[PDB]
RNA sequence: UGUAGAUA
């Protein structure tokens, strides 16, 4: 390194200033303590002081966008720099988007830059992803970037991402990074576009609720979706209430079904299991005794009306001195009051 | 008694 920096790593300069590290901006930024020294002084800095530094981040900007320390520095400028340094940084970035989006460091920046630019540059920076949509949605770095777009970017500039997901919904609603994206779209995108998705979604409601993350997506719509889409799902559940509340994943979804259904639907779903006797005993006998099902049951009571709840507990008197036996049942006896 | 994304 240089002594200047060596002296900084040894604490030999207590009131070190920006001007005093001219010619060494870069080096500093690829060094943890110096990157950190700059990140701080940039916030409390004169316009002359920032530009000084800027001058030296520009010609090796890409290098610092990928450095493990150099990347917070570029990001500071997006936060606290001038409009012109922000567009200038954009410049730097044009036609480098895809690569930085997939890089461990570059995409943090990209993620920040996407947050601090007018729609014009925002709109521009995104189309560079066109035709590598699915490649980014399934990347470990790329995926927060796409998510970052769906959030920051005006929705009408992202039809290419709705298209890209066509007939792809299940593979992604059943993917690790794939399903967070699908949530964003349903949180941000226009009716025009959340229609094909919600459509494929319903195509595999039964399967998705059994997926590791697939359910998180059905779970999303139940909570946040339009009441027309809820009812369709709850309907997928109606009947299957027994076979799914014993599922490790599917239980979590019936849960939110009983929570987010119509008043009516809700009182029908609940009742379904208070009178669809299964085997030796009745329906909710198993649900009580089951490692996952009991939460579904405890939820039954939660959302219930005083009328239909009374009836539930009346069906749960015949086994009071029966649940003490099974421990998962034990968490139920502490409610019949 | 029960489930999910990347930096010093």
| Structural contact between residues A99 and A62, judged by C-beta atoms closer than 8 angstroms | no
Task: Give the experimental resolution in Å.
Answer: 2.7
Domain containing residue A145: CATH number: 1.25.10.10
DSSP letters for A321-332: HHHTTSHHHHHH
Q: What is the DSSP letter of A226?
A: -
A112-116 LR contacts (CB < 8 Å, sep 24+): A112/A75, A112/A78, A112/A79, A113/A75, A113/A78, A113/A86, A113/A89, A114/A145, A114/A148, A114/A149, A114/A152, A114/A153, A115/A78, A115/A148, A115/A152, A116/A78, A116/A79, A116/A86
Cα separation of the two ends of chain A: 72
Taking the stretch 308-337 of protein chain A, residues with Cβ within 7 Å of any atom in nucleic acid chain B are: 328, 331
- Show Cβ contacts of residue A67 under 8 Å, excluding neighbours closer than 6 positions: A29, A30, A105
For tokens 């920051």, name the residue: A152
Closest-approach nucleotide to residue A294, Cα vs C1': B1
Quick one: A136 exposed, middle or buried, by C-beta within 10 A (0-12, 13-18, 19+)? buried
Closest CA to A239 of A206, A285, A201: A206
Which residue is it, tokens 């002296």? A7
User: Does the nearest atom of strand B lie within 7 Å of A103's Cβ?
Assistant: no
Distance A85 CA to B3 C1' (A): 45
Our measurement of CA A24 to C1' B4, in angstroms, reads 43
Rg over CA atoms, chain A: 28
Q: How many domains does chain A have?
A: 1
What one-character-per-residue DSSP string does A161-200 give? HHHHTTT-HHHHHTSTTHHHHHHHHHHHS-HHHHHHHHHH
The residue with tokens 């992803």 is A129
Give the nearest nucleotide to A36, CA to C1': B8
The nt closest to A211 (CA vs C1′) is B3
Output the CA–CA distances (angstroms, integers) from residue A34 to A51, A70, A313, in the order listed.
Answer: 18, 9, 66
Instruction: Tell if A37 CB is < 7 Å from nucleic strand B.
Output: no
Tokens of A190: 């226009």
CB A162 within 8 A of CB A185: yes
Token couple for A119:
């729609």
As a rounded value in angstroms, the CA-to-C1' distance for A38 and B2 is 46
Torsion of CA A213, A214, A217, A218, to 10 degrees: -130
Closest nucleotide to A108: CA versus each C1': B7
The helix/strand/coil state of A105 is coil
Distance measured from the CA of protein residue A138 to the C1' of nucleotide B6, in angstroms? 12
Give the closest residue to B6 (Cα–C1′). A141
Domain that holds residue A307: 1-337
If one counts every other C-beta atom within 10 angstroms of the C-beta of residue A217, the result is: 27
Query: How many Cα atoms are found within 13 Å in the side-chain-facing hemisphere of A25?
Result: 24
Residues 192-221 of A with CB under 7 A from strand B: 212-213, 215-216, 219
Dihedral sign for Cα atoms in the order A217, A218, A222, A226 = positive
CA A286 from centroid of its chain's CA atoms: 34
Q: Specify the length of chain A in residues.
A: 337
Q: Left, alpha or beta for A131 (phi > 0: left; psi -120 to 50: alpha)?
A: left
Coil, helix or strand at residue A23: coil
Q: Is the CB of A30 under 7 A from strand B?
A: no
Question: What is the SS3 assignment for A5?
Answer: helix
Cα–Cα dist A184/A220, whole Å = 10
Q: Is the CB of A173 under 7 A from strand B?
A: no
d(CA A157, CA A327): 54
Place of tokens 């609940």: A270
> Strand B positions with any atom < 7 Å from protein CB?
1-8
- Distance CA(A6)–CA(A152), nearest Å, equals 41
A186, two tokens: 């349903």
Q: Please tell me the distance from the alpha carbon of residue A75 to that of residue A88, in angstroms, as a whole number.
A: 13
CB neighbour list of residue A44: distance below 8 Å, 6 or more residues apart: none
Which residue has its C-alpha nearest to nucleotide B4's C1'?
A213
Query: Do residues A105 and A146 touch, judged by C-beta distance below 8 A?
Result: no
E strand or H helix at A113, and its extent?
helix A106-113
Residue pair A332/A298 in contact (Cβ under 8 Å)? The answer is yes
A334 Cβ neighbours under 8 A, 6+ residues apart = none
Give the orientation angle of helix A293-303 with respect to helix A250-260, to 10 degrees: 0
B5: residue with closest CA to C1': A177
Taking the CA of residue A107 and the C1' sugar atom of nucleotide B7, their distance in angstroms comes to 10
Q: How far is residue A146's CA from residue A136's CA, in Å, rounded to a whole number?
A: 7
CA–CA separation, A259 and A262 (whole Å): 9
Indicate which technique resolved this structure. Answer: X-ray
Query: Alpha-carbon distance A24 to A249, whole Å?
Result: 54
Is-contact A72 A80, C-beta < 8 A? no
SS3 assignment, position A107: helix
Does an H or E element contain A140, and which? none
Q: Residue A322: what are its φ and ψ, rounded to 5°? A: -125, -25
């Amino acid at each position: 390194r240089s002594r200047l920096l060596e002296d900084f790593r040894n604490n030999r300069y207590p009131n070190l200033q920006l001007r005093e590290i001219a010619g060494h901006i870069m080096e500093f930024s690829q060094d943890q303590h110096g990157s950190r020294f700059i990140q701080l002084k940039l916030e409390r800095a004169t316009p002359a002081e920032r530009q000084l530094v800027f001058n030296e981040i520009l010609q090796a900007a890409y290098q610092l966008m990928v450095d493990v320390f150099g990347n917070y520095v570029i990001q500071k400028f997006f936060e606290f720099g001038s409009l012109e340094q922000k567009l200038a940084l954009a410049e730097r970035i044009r036609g480098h988007v895809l690569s930085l989006a997939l890089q461990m460091y570059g995409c943090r920046v990209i993620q920040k830059a996407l947050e601090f630019i007018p729609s014009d540059q925002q709109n521009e920076m995104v189309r560079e992803l066109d035709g590598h949509v699915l490649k980014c949605v399934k990347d470990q770095n790329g995926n927060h970037v796409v998510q970052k777009c769906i959030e920051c970017v005006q929705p009408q500039s992202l039809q290419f991402i709705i298209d890209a997901f066509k007939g792809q919904v299940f593979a992604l609603s059943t993917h690790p990074y794939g399903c967070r994206v699908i949530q964003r779209i349903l949180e941000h995108c226009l009716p025009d576009q959340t229609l094909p998705i919600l459509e494929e979604l319903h195509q595999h409601t039964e399967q998705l609720v059994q997926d590791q993350y697939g359910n998180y997506v059905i779970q999303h719509v139940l909570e946040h979706g339009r009441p027309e889409d809820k009812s369709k799902i709850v309907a997928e559940i109606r009947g299957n209430v027994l076979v799914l509340s014993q599922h490790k994943f599917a239980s979590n979804v019936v849960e939110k079904c009983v929570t987010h259904a119509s008043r009516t639907e809700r009182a029908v779903l609940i009742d379904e299991v208070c009178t669809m006797n299964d085997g030796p005993h009745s329906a909710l006998y198993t649900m009580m005794k089951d490692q996952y099902a009991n939460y579904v049951v405890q939820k039954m009571i939660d959302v219930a009306e005083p009328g239909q709840r009374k009836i539930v507990m009346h069906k749960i008197r015949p086994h009071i001195a029966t649940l003490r036996k099974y421990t998962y049942g034990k968490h139920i006896l502490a409610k019949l009051e």
